[PDB]
């Protein structure tokens, strides 16, 4: 189970290596939302995307 989970994570990261970020969205509240192939979150900041 652990080996397969880690292998799946590695393969997903390798696939996402090419063209990580598609674009950006500006919200009417003046926020920013980055759209890409992977979900990257700041584990040190309450997992803010």
């Amino acid at each position: 189970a652990e080996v397969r989970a880690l292998a799946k994570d590695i393969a997903r990261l390798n696939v996402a290596d090419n063209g990580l970020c598609f674009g950006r969205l500006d919200t009417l509240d003046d926020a920013r939302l980055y759209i890409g192939r992977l979900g990257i979150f700041d584990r040190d900041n309450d997992f803010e995307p």
Binding site: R4, A7, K8
Partner: protein
């Protein structure tokens, strides 16, 4: 040529069936290796790295690897171009006089990495020097090409 016998610690004797010993020694620990999923359905588990018993089966049967990595036919200098999903690598041989091209290398497979002692040269890139039989793409080289 065979040399010291592992069981007796002395030079192998004439007539010893080293072949069966090697077969048993390689096969007995096979149960410790990772294997293909035993679930009947689902997607192919070989898409993710499963390099355990299946890899040994592939090697001993001399079958073409799934993630085949082309090898350099000639030593020289590498010049590299990239596209949306394909690489276009070429080797210019220093002592040779003809460019050797690899034109259909998918980008879903990564390039080779050097990891030099102190230069930290990292991934293969234009201008690097490659010897004969070096792997250009990160993966598994085909035994027949070698």
């Amino acid at each position: 040529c065979y040399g010291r016998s592992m069981a007796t610690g002395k030079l192998v004797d004439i007539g010893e069936a080293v072949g069966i010993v090697a077969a048993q020694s390689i096969g007995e620990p096979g149960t410790q290796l990772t294997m293909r999923t035993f679930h009947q359905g689902g997607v192919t588990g070989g898409a993710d790295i499963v390099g355990g018993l299946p890899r040994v089966q592939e090697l001993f049967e001399a079958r073409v690897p799934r993630n085949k990595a082309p090898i350099a036919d000639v030593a020289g200098r590498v010049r590299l171009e990239e596209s949306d999903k394909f690489f276009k690598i070429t080797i210019v041989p220093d002592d040779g006089g003809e460019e050797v091209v690899y034109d259909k290398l998918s980008k879903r497979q990564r390039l080779r990495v050097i990891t030099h002692e102190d230069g930290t040269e990292g991934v293969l890139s234009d201008g690097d020097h490659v010897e004969v039989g070096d792997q250009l793409m990160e993966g598994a080289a085909d035994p027949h090409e070698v």
